[PDB]
Design a binder for this molecule. Sequence first.
Ligand SMILES: [Cs+]
Ligand SMILES: [Cs+]
Ligand SMILES: [Cs+]
Ligand SMILES: [Cs+]
Length: 453
Amino acid sequence: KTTKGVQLLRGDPKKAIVRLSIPMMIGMSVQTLYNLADGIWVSGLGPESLAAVGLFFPVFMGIIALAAGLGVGTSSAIARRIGARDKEGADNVAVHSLILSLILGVTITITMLPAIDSLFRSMGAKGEAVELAIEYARVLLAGAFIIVFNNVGNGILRGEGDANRAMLAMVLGSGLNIVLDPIFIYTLGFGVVGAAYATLLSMVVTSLFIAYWLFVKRDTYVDITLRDFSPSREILKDILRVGLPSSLSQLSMSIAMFFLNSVAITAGGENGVAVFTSAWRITMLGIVPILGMATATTSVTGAAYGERNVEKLETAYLYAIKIAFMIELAVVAFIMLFAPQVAYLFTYSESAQVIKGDLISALRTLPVFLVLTPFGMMTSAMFQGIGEGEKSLILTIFRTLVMQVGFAYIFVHYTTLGLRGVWIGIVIGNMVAAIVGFLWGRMRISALKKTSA
Ligand SMILES: [Cs+]
Ligand SMILES: [Cs+]
Ligand SMILES: [Cs+]
Ligand SMILES: [Cs+]
């Protein structure tokens, strides 16, 4: 009466990390290929049409930070019960989270829909760029509960080791969205608002398959049934303890990106922001694989934390850092060698402004930080696995807003490095946060050996 995702989740910690990471890397690859190709479609629409997405993109990131945030907290809570062999509790958590996905998604829609016209006019935009963004937001905000349900539902699969179907749910939504984008935007001539319907229909098809697995097939490990009674303020707090900080982590990382561009303004003008933007867009080739192992670390370490197997937890937390470090080592060495080739496809295709000199030198300096992020992300994933999610938020605020932002402000205003000193500061800043992250992790690991012995 045990599923294969669960049996894999409770088994070998080293095997569970590899087996649950590879599906998550593939799913986010399709999500990255969507976001990559979508920009190529929307940019070829016009000037005031490209600004309409720019006004809504922060609103989109905010909703995703809430949906995926609630998804991470749900996945962790279910993973700890399954580790503790508390299926009745893991069932109650799955029902609790699905009820929250309905409450949260409706709250996002009733809140945002009024405060849209006043929000998009705050940046001073007016006319077509505002009216398009208002219509573009009216589409994706009408189906907010689908975005939350798709994230919570995907988290219920990852919580019980079902990373396979949790990957399929991602490739189904993003795959259709890659296909539906040029058809709705160009072939049918819907325009920029067509990209909001391609996303909506894609997430609608995904929601049906998730609901088909959770309520019709019911082949998941958890029993999602409202038949009995168990409203738990304890479970509600346990889900939100990882949920709310994970959302604020995305906000903290976002605010940190806003300051780095303002430092890139002072460092090397306006295209220095474009060189900066084109630089970290390339580093997504390395951030995506880590995000995969981050989702697997949370469910594996949480499964060990629920099983009260601290050695299994530590063996998993260290193995996740070692594997991620070697995958980035290959990614960094690949991007750093063929850097003039990666920039060739990123800046010279548009002969409107050549910025190959600064982007190439940044690709030999910035991707150095990709080998240090596993020390901070696996730590954040391990704090989320054991439930102590506020520690992941503290580690993120220190890494982004303090170390990376601080080292970039100092290496520009108080040195002669200039624009290249921005990438120097982010690497050195992330390097100091790697020490703090990796040490905080192993320090938290030992505290649980004391509590159990
Ligand atoms: Cs988008
Ligand atoms: Cs509607
Ligand atoms: Cs079941
Ligand atoms: Cs200066």
